Symmetry: C3
Subunit: 366 residues, 3 copies
């Protein structure tokens, strides 16, 4: 295996783009949603847990997520990237770029949880939760889906992390909101816009190469986001009598989340439909407690996107086609099972992480 | 034709960069220029018409702009990108990337109009105008210049859209301001800075490849922007006795607009001269009604850049050279004719789009 | 020598990223640190001196920095990029891209000085200082380190500009603060986040190619930044009893500065250690007059990073290995000598630039 420098270049820039999604995208997103007096402490928690994730990732996280082991975790042979030759190749890129790309996914997933709950949670408590949860939820689920583990080995389809990122974080957020118990819309908009732009590295980069699947993922991201903005805004216009900015921004996130598992597997007709459905699903979600509506958008649209990936991957619907020997009904069942496993896995581990913080330092911010 | 993955990578990142120019660049630019109480509604209109453009682009816009047809429009054989193989190659990149790149140009052009006028226009009215105007002005002009139509076939020079983007939008904006009848400078600056960075994807990406013409376009963008900042600020310092931030930011946009048609055709000596002249032209423009000075900068500097492309493309002036058999005088005439056609075409269609909104929903915001 | 289009693409995007660091990164960083009433004038000075640097760079700066001459400066054979064929290749990229990449380093270095002092300095005075200082400090030091001059020829290690950018600017800033005599933390955070993302083009781009050294520089940037955030925040938590946002952001800059000279030469274990030490060094620095703590972070962490590059480059410590015939003790001595030369060179020239402004227009803002 030799590294292709074009893919190297692509994947380094895509990594910078996914890092951009956390620092400052999600921070500004939540920054505009929470009360003014809580913004500074939230930005600090997002910055510091971000740093924590990057360090834990390189120390053991990448090895346990991406090393070969069992169905659930990898190994500890790549501690501090030991035994990874600088010139080692993973896919068509230097493995070091693969480390950085996959790490940036860990970052945004944790950022999604921490930004939503930072307002409510004690600082030392969130550090404890991130350690437990990254280690016991993010790493194994990443392994199961993208490290050749359980879900992958059953053919689960999840191009860029409807399960690993979105449902995983949504449930952890809901569990936290439950245990624990917009001031600036131009900032919300700015954070959303940065998330949007970053999400091209997230979705297109998940191809691992600057090929036609990256191209397809890129075009589907544009399409599903636009469709979800319009779906949300129409639903809002039909219901409230007027569109709002928060609605437009929420619609955009909804489409982005919806298309995340699907983007490299579906055609543009499917991205449009997933977009519309995700935007309206998101609107339904937030209408029907959910901290900064993390689940209403990431959770509901994550589930919707994962299921619809099992439909719209079909050749007959413009997608790339199911794997050899797989029917739509079989794929749908695998998508459903993948979503169920992710919900229970993340829920149990988040519960454990939050309880441990609470038993040691106390959860609620003094 | 085989896709080069280096060009694939380059052009996907350049597309993300041009998308960045609208979401959030132009939105923050206008956001800082208009009254505080109008900002939210403007951001909503920019976000939603952006979404609309992306959807119309993939549904029929790309096909009608880039399909082969006549001198004025393409065809409807690529509706929803039907009959475009995923592995289809356009130039040296996957055609799907070409769709996304060209679409992002449609977005920023509409963003330039909608951001300037959102404050004044009814929401449903702007949706109507965007449909009419994208379909009947943007698409045909894109076709004429970049889809092998009228202007291209006469050898018009317009590397990145002095006519298609800048003059097109400026006139539509002026027509709207006429029919219809800075609060936050750090936001203006931030929007300008984002437009600047995005504009590297806009200008250098227009080469379609990461070659020496992309390199040249990139260097000319840096140079013409810097020269226009200094030209504007000196003119302002000579006139008002002091430079201002809005002046510096306007100077930057002026240079960027000026160099847009020229950047891949001229040498750095020419970029410097175009820069200075565009900055001083911009300053003159805004000095001598023009909504958020859209025309004073995009219109005047667009015309100036298009004309000066017909001079500075000459080999003798450091440019790449006129096409075979073309003299400077002949090229100048083609540039002038291209500008005239674009002004009248955009003006008539914007008038039609605004009148239709006004006859159906009413133009002015209740 | 033929240009590799993958490296072309990479290096054009990296240049856009470094430009992003100034426009708007450092401007927003300082914008949030200085009093509200000084922000507009500071943003104007950053924008205009940025433009000035870009123009001086293309006119003579690139030629005098990167042309072949003596140990201290290049030549004037590339005035306005004359005698540089468009298809000329430097390393594995078109030389025009090398011009733009190196120019963007000049920009951020000047931005670091001007942003810190703009509040205090007369506008015409800063223009004078930038001309003198770019020409007589930045250019020769760039030449000595990266243009085959004195420091390079003695084997100084400085991957991305611990000396050329960070120490150079810190000293110029200290000299200015001496001669001359946070309002918005979400803005500080946003500027820091943009600096962070841009810094991937800065560090990884300094490889000049999308190879395994770019990959290594990229991963070390993530690691050293995260380690420095944690180092600073722990030191702050140990001292003040609580972490702060300004602390977290300062920690990030500290790590980024620290790893700058080292990132392409060290392993991830070394990046972690440099990170921690840089964060704690930065915290010590700002604790023990220093305009917007430019030296406390850029100066102290620059020195720390340059020294630690002479340790952590060793094969035995996970680095790439010292050059043939070089021991750790010899390398350390060269690092120390490089830092001393840079401090004295920049100090003397900044003194001269500030005195000349002061004798002609007066330094202090009326």
């Amino acid at each position: 295996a030799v590294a292709d420098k074009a893919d190297n270049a692509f994947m380094m820039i895509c990594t910078a783009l996914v890092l951009f999604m956390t620092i400052p995208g999600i921070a500004l997103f939540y920054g505009g949603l929470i009360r003014g007096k809580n913004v500074l402490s939230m930005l600090t928690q997002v910055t510091v847990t971000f740093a924590l994730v990057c360090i834990l990732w390189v120390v053991y996280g990448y090895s346990l997520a991406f090393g070969e082991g069992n169905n659930f975790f990898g190994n500890i042979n790549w501690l501090m990237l030991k035994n990874i030759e600088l010139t080692a190749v993973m896919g068509s890129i230097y493995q070091y770029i693969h480390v950085a790309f996959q790490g940036s996914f860990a970052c945004i997933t944790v950022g999604l949880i921490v930004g939503a709950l930072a307002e409510r949670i004690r600082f030392s408590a969130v550090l404890i939760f991130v350690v437990v949860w990254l280690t016991l939820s993010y790493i194994p689920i990443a392994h199961m889906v993208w490290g050749g583990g359980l879900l992958a080995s059953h053919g689960a389809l999840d191009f860029a992390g409807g399960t690993v990122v979105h449902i995983n974080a949504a449930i952890a957020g809901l569990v936290g909101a439950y245990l624990i118990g917009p001031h600036n819309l131009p900032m919300v908009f700015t954070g959303t816009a940065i998330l949007y732009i970053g999400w091209f590295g997230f979705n297109a980069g998940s191809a691992g190469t600057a090929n036609e699947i990256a191209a397809l993922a890129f075009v589907n991201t544009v399409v599903a986001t636009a469709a979800a903005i319009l779906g949300w805004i129409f639903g809002e216009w039909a219901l409230r009598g007027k569109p709002s900015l928060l609605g437009a921004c929420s619609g955009a996130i909804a489409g982005l989340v919806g298309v995340t598992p699907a983007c490299g597997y579906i055609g543009v007709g499917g991205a449009l439909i997933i977009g519309v459905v995700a935007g309206l699903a998101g609107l339904w979600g937030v209408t029907m407690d959910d901290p900064c509506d993390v689940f209403g958008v990431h959770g509901v649209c994550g589930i919707v996107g994962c299921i619809m990936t099992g439909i719209f991957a079909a050749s007959s619907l413009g997608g790339v086609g199911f794997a050899e020997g797989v029917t739509m009904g079989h794929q749908l069942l695998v998508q459903l099972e993948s979503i169920a496993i992710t919900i229970v896995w993340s829920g149990v581990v988040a519960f454990i992480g939050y309880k441990l913080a609470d038993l040691t330092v106390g959860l609620r911010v003094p």
